[PDB]
């Protein structure tokens with residue numbers, strides 16, 4: 001690793017994600033290879049989220065990757081938003097197809113004709129379905145690995161309810177699960193909010209979101225999203241059922257959709273990584289502990305070296321007995337300093353050093369990757385202390401990022417205050433009228449050199465909006481404190 | 489209740505059963521089908537078994553892009569020539585024509601191997617063992633059939649690269665018996681391990697191994713899983729080369745395998761075990777292993793009954809038996825019987841008021857319909873017993889069929905007779921592509937011709953020395969399994 005994270009964030013990021021062997025570049029731009037080191041993180045997130053939504057009654061399934069032209073168009077706001085980046089398959093071989101078919105940018109228009117077929121009565125609701133699949137949004141803007149890509153992996157959940165209340169309840173349950181993914185799995189603090197009218201999902205009624213802050217770049221990013229679509233899709237696809245209390249009254253299903261993508265890993269990189277490379281939260285780390293033999297003096301007896309390799313394997317089995325994911329790196333090819341650096345780059349939480357003296361002093365050394373602190377631990381305590389230390393790394397990482405967010409998110413009540421705070425690389429909760437025209441005016445007059453976008457309306461703002469407060473536009477009364485910033 | 493009869497109209501029976509069991513929904517684009525939860529759970533059961541197994545072998549999961557460049561797509565010529573007609577091309581985003589068309593993967597050799605070339609520099613960088621669960625597209629214009637032959641399907645594809653040929657060779661057989669376990673221990677389907685002929689092998693591979701299942705209802709056989717030794721065919725083309733100090737200055741080409749298994753599995757399960765009442769789920773893969781159904785339906789009597797049902801539910805979740813209590817009051821018991829029979833749940837546990845008061849219940853096996861009265865005591869015992877017995881039963885009934893329908897013939901006269909019987913045939917075979925073409929042509933001439941299925945590792949007989957191929961002109965190389973196929 002050669003570029004410094006605070007000097008050039010993009011070069012740093014690219015260096016870190018490739019040299020940790022998370023990402024390989026592919027010869028089609030905006031498409032990247034998820035190598036096992038990153039895919040294992042996606043799999044940990046999947047293990048957690050899948051079990052949680054199972055408890056909520058959601059079931060997994062798989063819908064086709066192709067959308068017909070007429071299905072894609074039924075909900076005009078939604079297709080108006082997505083149409084410019086829909087990839088169209090037009091031949092197979094040199095044989096033109098009968099009709100162009102589109103690759104799913106999002107599966108509402110794939111799934112909801114099916115929903116309409118399956119909802120025949122109030123007993124068929126609710127329908128709670130989820131799929132883990134890939135989608136394509138073929139924008140021409142510059143792509144960025146993990147954060148903004150042309151193909152990405154994700155989950156998308158789609159549910160249909162008889163009543164608005166059960167649907168509004170699910171929206172928030174899911175959004176809290178996303179917050180749990182970011183905060184408990186990835187040790188990333190997030191702000192829960194609602195999108196403004198301009199930023200909400202096209203076709204939906206309201207969008208709830210979690211926002212993360214990346215202090216290196218001073219910019220925020222959406223980490224997850226949970227929409228209430230209301231009846232805007234069920235009216236276009238005729239997902240209908242007869243009202244049970246009133247005969248012949250056809251009702252339209254109330255719908256939500258919600259998605260979470262591999263953006264998660266990029267945020268985890270941008271937030272925790274440092275100038276030695278990746279830093280993996282223990283809860284998602286592929287390897288949690290790497291055992292590395294040191295000493296190896298060359299005047300060591302064959303008896304001594306064989307006994308040290310033995311002791312390393314004793315540690316390995318020890319840690320496996322208590323469910324710690326542990327790799328012993330007993331390769332004679334590379335030097336110990338080499339391996340130290342190699343596993344630091346990948347961000348293994350703990351490096352476990354065993355050397356001939358500590359080996360017979362009944363102890364070993366643990367090195368935390370987050371703080372760099374070396375600890376000497378007696379053999380006896382290993383699995384206990386190591387687990388206590390993995391816990392402490394998780395906490396420590398979360399805490400640091402929280403201190404970042406608390407320091408870098410502040411209130412401002414006028415446009416001048418706002419502009420200067422924003423220009424110090426912070427995000428700002430300002431009083432806002434909610435109007436698209438004023439949001440555009442903000443983005444215009446506030447131009448790391450782009451105008452601020454609205455990021456969300458927090459469920460729990462920093463200040464209480466005082467009666468009669470006017471927006472930053474000055475022309476209209478303010479409706480809510482809203483988090484604004486520069487954005488990925 | 490099911491309408492069509494398997495032995496009368498197999499295609500209609502199949503469509504009826506896959507839709508009414510709520511496995512498949514149709515899509516407005518022909519050739520693509522919706523896997524609903526009931527089918528997807530079977531896929532996920534296969535997924536869990538196979539994932540654990542290949543992990544013990546040192547394969548890791550990953551995810552490669554869906555799109556291939558023209559340059560990459562053509563670098564190995566035999567492979568590209570075989571797949572090009574069925575490759576779907578993206579040509580525009582929105583109303584914007586792309587400068588270069590790009591292709592959707594029909595298989596991911598040409599996505600993955602340019603990366604393999606960058607990762608390999610020394611023998612220490614080997615082996616590379618990567619697997620991906622993903623979707624592929626093969627846009628063929630023949631008529632699709634759900635699960636069996638679709639234009640989009642889910643699969644796993646494993647790709648391995650090794651410094652030496654012996655390691656590669658070992659892995660091909662390891663993966664192939666994993667596939668055989670998936671079929672024989674999970675879906676209760678017997679299969680034939682063998683080698684593809686030169687006409688049927690993976691284009692640009694060295695050799696292809698395969699497992700074939702037999703579908704007695706149609707009389708046809710189907711490939712179920714595939715494991716290819718690619719040799720150095722692709723690494724020479726994508727320059728996956730390494731230096732090893734044992735052989736100074738020689739750039740050495742990696743030895744490579746690829747291996748794949750698809751949702752076709754589920755369809756073969758359906759074709760093999762389904763009956764005229766609908767799907768029949770093997771206990772090992774069944775989403776729901778036992779469905780508890782309250783029968784009958786005062787109130788203290790009603791409430792007591794939903795409660796004893798929930799009692800059985802908690803007791804069965806205790807012992808990791810996958811169980812549903814269908815306590816919906818908006819559907820009658822008969823409706824529920826029919827519904828879960830259509831979905832093939834292995835065991836129906838009926839609780840009526842009389843037997844609730846008599847500390848007993850009734851278990852009904854889906855595969856034989858046989859009803860058994862059971863004490864409340866043995867619910868965790870006898871049920872676990874019965875499920876196990878159902879699994880073996882499905883397997884043994886399947887095997888009988890295979891062993892009755894797979895026979896030897898050593899002359900074309902016999903071969904044709906037995907083939908028209910609805911059976912599959914092992915014949916002495918020269919191995920040549922022309923002979924195989926001719927077997928197909930004349931077996932249709934004298935409603936489709938027979939194709940080579942595999943060359944069995946363990947044939948039914950051994951070839952007499954000096955014996956001739958069933959064509960007469962060339963010495964037979966091996967016994968080869970022929971038959972009509974999907």
Ligand SMILES: COc1cncc(-c2cc(F)cc(CNC(=O)c3cc(N4CC[C@@](C#N)(C5CC5)C4=O)cc(C)n3)c2)c1
Nearest residue numbers: 030137139141142143147148149152222223224225259261
């Ligand atoms: C908006 O101006 C841009 C600026 N700079 C670059 C681009 C751009 C460039 C490209 F080459 C390709 C693309 C297309 N991909 C994406 O837009 C995208 C969106 C998301 N999203 C959107 C919000 C969400 C959350 N939570 C949704 C739940 C899903 C989530 O994860 C995730 C990923 C990996 N990719 C965009 C666009």
Ligand SMILES: COc1cncc(-c2cc(F)cc(CNC(=O)c3cc(N4CC[C@@](C#N)(C5CC5)C4=O)cc(C)n3)c2)c1
Nearest residue numbers: 626628630631632636637638639641711712713714748750
């Ligand atoms: C043979 O002439 C035909 C006759 N009648 C119809 C078609 C046809 C019609 C379509 F509309 C679409 C297609 C394309 N899909 C497939 O070719 C295909 C192959 C496999 N395969 C191939 C062997 C394999 C195994 N084991 C390999 C591991 C992969 C395995 O599962 C599985 C599935 C679900 N689909 C074919 C073709």
Ligand code: PRO
Nearest residue numbers: 106156225257258259
């Ligand atoms: O694209 C989105 O944001 C929604 C959430 C998952 C499905 N579509």
Ligand code: PRO
Nearest residue numbers: 595645714746747748
């Ligand atoms: O397409 C096939 O059949 C082989 C096996 C999976 C990858 N390629």
Ligand SMILES: [Ca+2]
Nearest residue numbers: 008010011012
């Ligand atoms: Ca630069």
Ligand SMILES: [Ca+2]
Nearest residue numbers: 081082083084
């Ligand atoms: Ca758009």
Ligand SMILES: [Ca+2]
Nearest residue numbers: 361362363378
């Ligand atoms: Ca000591």
Ligand SMILES: [Ca+2]
Nearest residue numbers: 570571573574
């Ligand atoms: Ca072909």
Ligand SMILES: [Ca+2]
Nearest residue numbers: 693694695719
């Ligand atoms: Ca050869």
Ligand SMILES: [Ca+2]
Nearest residue numbers: 736737738739
């Ligand atoms: Ca040379």
Ligand SMILES: [Cl-]
Nearest residue numbers: 096097098099
């Ligand atoms: Cl077409």
Ligand SMILES: [Cl-]
Nearest residue numbers: 192458459460
């Ligand atoms: Cl909140």
Ligand SMILES: [Cl-]
Nearest residue numbers: 498499502706
């Ligand atoms: Cl058929």
Ligand SMILES: [Cl-]
Nearest residue numbers: 813814815816
């Ligand atoms: Cl129920």
Ligand SMILES: [Zn+2]
Nearest residue numbers: 433438471473
């Ligand atoms: Zn305003």
Ligand SMILES: [Zn+2]
Nearest residue numbers: 918923957959
């Ligand atoms: Zn011959």
